[PDB]
Every structure is written in structure tokens, then in C-alpha cells.
Design a protein around this ligand. Structure first.
Ligand SMILES: O=C(NCc1cccc2c1OCCO2)c1ccc(-c2ccncc2)cc1
Length: 378
């Protein structure tokens, strides 16, 4: 009874009010179809509740509460939209995940970690989640908007000098160190996921791939999850690794920022795959691109096999690398210092740093499509 009423209050709890209400809406959704409403039990339960449930539906946060400004992202299971909460006039970025496509495509469990990271990390390096809600169609994640854009954009609009690359690499390293210390492994670190704020400081997003480590600080996942150009060889070979798979992505990141291309870029999907697997022979810095001996050493320090990769022993071996020598910041204050690109913003809905961008079958027997999404509302 002690932990009972504590868990009804507790935001991390599966039996709090939002989850208890999720369970009721879900039950109503899943059952209200004449094909199933034939049943006396389904009918009397719907009779008693449909009127009240319809009333909560509107009393709770809806997609309807937001004016959809523009679409700033598009992923496997949905889109990211630039929105404004009608009542509060407050601007947020809202990520949408299609429930239909999460059932049709088998994967409908990644969002739990994604939500929890953003919701509770309370880290300058992690995009914050304010609200999480749902409807018959989607899963909605309301986040702190990042007007600075992503590092895909920054790279496309600039010739990135080593002074800038020093800063962004350092911010990514500390961001992944914060993710790691929460007992998490990103598995999908890439420029499309590195976002810039009002001040031009880095924050990570797309925590879908993320997995909780063992007591050993390792993960037993016999499936390759991530993006071609940035996947490490050990994760291609996984199809029992540590957090050093994220440092490999940092190597690729630095190489792309300096050279202008990814170090294993190929014509085909399997070509990149084969290039990565032969990194010892496929990786080479082009002559015309003037890369320092310190920048080359660090790309090479991460773009090796996991058994000798920099970071395998901790962040400290990364931090002390000669490449990070500068007259602008320290590992203890980068975020307090002025970023290389400070974004000029015309408005609170300025989306200039971002590029321009399903019907469930009515059942005849109980399916329970809403059940895997009970507890999502935060
Ligand atoms: O996870 C992201 N995109 C990937 C993505 C989007 C949609 C469905 C997906 C998916 O990935 C795999 C599953 O299906 C993401 C990108 C950018 C922001 C953001 C935050 C603040 N300000 C501006 C932008 C937030 C999240």
C-alpha cells in the first residue's frame, strides 16, 4: 500500500494516472466496432464508458492543441514537425511515430528508451521531452526545439576548419559520455542526430537504437542497428559489444567534417558495408585535403578495431589527445564558451537551418493494437 499510492504519483511508474487512463482509452478504442459490439459484455462496458472516455479524449492533450508550422524531419516510422502549442503560443518540435507501421513492421518497443532518455536525462547534451501523448493513429513526443539545425546543414553551408572540428568533436564526445554514464549506448550517432541550439551548442537526438548495458557495461544484441556510413565493423559483425561502437562514429564524423566525404562512401549499400569491413585497407586521406598530423591521428585512433580503439578505457584517453589543443575552451566549460557558428534567427519559428520536406483494418475479433502503447502518455 506504501509503494501503491507512491506509484500512482510516480512519473516513472507503469500504474500512474496517465497509464491507468491510457489503459481505459485503449480498451475503448480496441472494442468499439459493431463486429465486436455484438457481444453483450463489450456493449455494456462501452455503454457505461464511451460517453466519459470521449470527454477525457478532449480534456487531455491532443495533436489538435498544436499549429503545425512546418515539417523539419522524416524517419522510418514518421516525421518530426515544427509546432506551436495554440493555447500557450510556445514553440516545440514534435516527433510522430505511426502505430500502424510499428505493428506492420514488427518493431514497436524502441520508443520507451527514447522517451525516458529525453524525459529524465536532465543533461545539457540531451534534447528535453516536455510532453508525450497518443491517439488511435500516432505516438507524439513534444520536445525542446533546436533552431540551430543539424550538423548535416552546417557541413553543407561551410568549409569546416580544424578549429571548428575541435569544438564539435569535443561537444559530441561529452554528449556520448553523458549517454554512456546513464548506462546507455547510442548505436546511431551521426550529423543528422547532432543538433544545434539558440547559441549554436550541440545536443543529441534519435535515441531509438539505444540499449541498457549489463553490469559488465556490455550489450548482447545479435542484430545490426544503425546507418550505413556511420556503423562500426563490430555492429556489422553483430548480425557482445561495448560503448566503443559510438567512438567509431566520432571518427567517421571528424573525417567527414574535415575531408568533405565519409571515409567509406560507396556506390552501393553493400559496397559501403564491404568498405567498412576492410577499413584497414579502404580508409585513406586524400592528398589535396590538408589534414593535420593530429587530426589524422585521431580519425585513425577511432577508425580501428574495437580491441585497440581510442575510448575503449574511457573518455579521459580521448580528452587528452593533442588534436584538442586550443585557445578557446576547456573540457570543463566548452558549453559556457562561444560556439564557432552562432545562428541568426529571424523568429521563434525560424526553420531556415532545416531542409524542406496506414489505415488499420477494422477487426472481427479482438486484436489489441493499442495494448503495446499503454503507459506512453507522460
Ligand atoms: O529522432 C529524430 N528523427 C528520426 C525519426 C523521425 C521520425 C520517425 C522516426 C525517426 O527515426 C527512426 C524511427 O522513425 C529526431 C530528429 C530531430 C529532432 C529535433 C529536435 C528538436 N528540434 C529539431 C529537431 C528530434 C528527433
Amino acid at each position: 500500500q506504501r509503494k501503491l499510492e507512491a506509484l500512482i504519483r510516480d512519473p516513472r511508474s507503469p500504474i500512474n494516472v496517465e497509464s491507468l487512463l491510457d489503459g481505459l482509452n485503449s480498451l475503448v478504442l480496441d472494442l468499439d466496432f459493431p463486429a465486436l459490439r455484438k457481444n453483450k459484455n463489450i456493449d455494456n462496458f462501452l455503454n457505461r464508458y464511451e460517453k466519459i472516455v470521449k470527454k477525457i479524449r478532449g480534456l487531455q492533450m491532443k495533436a489538435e492543441d498544436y499549429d503545425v508550422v512546418k515539417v523539419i524531419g522524416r524517419g522510418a516510422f514518421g516525421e518530426v514537425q515544427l509546432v506551436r502549442h495554440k493555447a500557450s503560443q510556445k514553440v516545440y518540435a514534435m516527433k510522430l511515430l505511426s502505430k500502424f507501421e510499428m505493428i506492420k513492421r514488427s518493431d514497436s518497443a524502441f520508443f520507451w528508451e527514447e522517451r525516458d532518455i529525453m524525459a529524465f536525462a536532465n543533461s545539457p547534451w540531451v534534447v528535453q521531452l516536455f510532453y508525450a501523448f497518443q491517439d488511435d493513429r500516432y505516438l507524439y513526443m513534444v520536445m525542446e526545439y533546436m533552431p540551430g539545425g543539424d550538423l548535416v546543414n552546417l557541413m553543407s553551408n561551410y568549409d569546416v576548419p580544424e578549429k571548428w572540428a575541435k569544438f564539435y568533436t569535443a561537444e559530441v564526445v561529452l554528449a556520448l559520455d553523458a549517454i554512456h554514464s546513464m548506462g546507455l549506448i547510442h548505436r546511431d550517432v551521426k550529423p543528422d542526430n547532432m543538433l544545434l541550439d539558440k547559441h549554436g551548442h550541440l545536443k543529441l537526438a534519435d535515441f531509438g537504437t539505444c540499449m541498457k548495458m549489463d553490469e559488465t557495461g556490455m550489450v548482447h544484441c545479435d542484430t545490426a542497428v544503425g546507418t550505413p556510413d556511420y556503423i562500426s565493423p563490430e555492429v556489422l559483425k553483430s548480425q557482445f559489444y561495448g560503448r566503443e561502437c559510438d567512438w567509431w562514429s566520432v571518427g567517421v564524423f571528424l573525417y567527414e567534417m574535415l575531408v568533405g566525404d565519409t571515409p567509406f562512401y560507396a556506390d552501393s549499400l553493400v559496397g559501403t558495408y564491404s568498405k567498412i569491413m576492410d577499413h584497414k585497407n579502404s580508409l585513406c586521406f586524400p592528398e589535396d585535403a590538408e589534414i593535420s598530423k593530429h587530426a589524422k591521428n585521431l580519425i585513425c585512433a577511432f577508425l580501428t578495431d574495437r580491441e585497440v580503439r581510442l575510448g575503449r578505457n574511457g573518455v579521459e584517453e580521448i580528452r587528452q589527445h593533442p588534436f584538442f589543443k586550443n585557445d578557446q575552451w576547456h573540457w570543463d566549460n566548452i558549453r559556457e564558451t562561444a560556439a564557432p557558428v552562432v545562428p541568426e534567427l529571424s523568429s521563434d519559428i525560424d526553420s531556415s537551418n532545416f531542409d524542406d520536406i496506414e489505415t488499420f483494418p477494422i477487426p472481427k475479433a479482438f486484436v489489441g493494437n493499442q495494448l503495446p502503447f499503454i503507459g506512453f502518455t507522460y
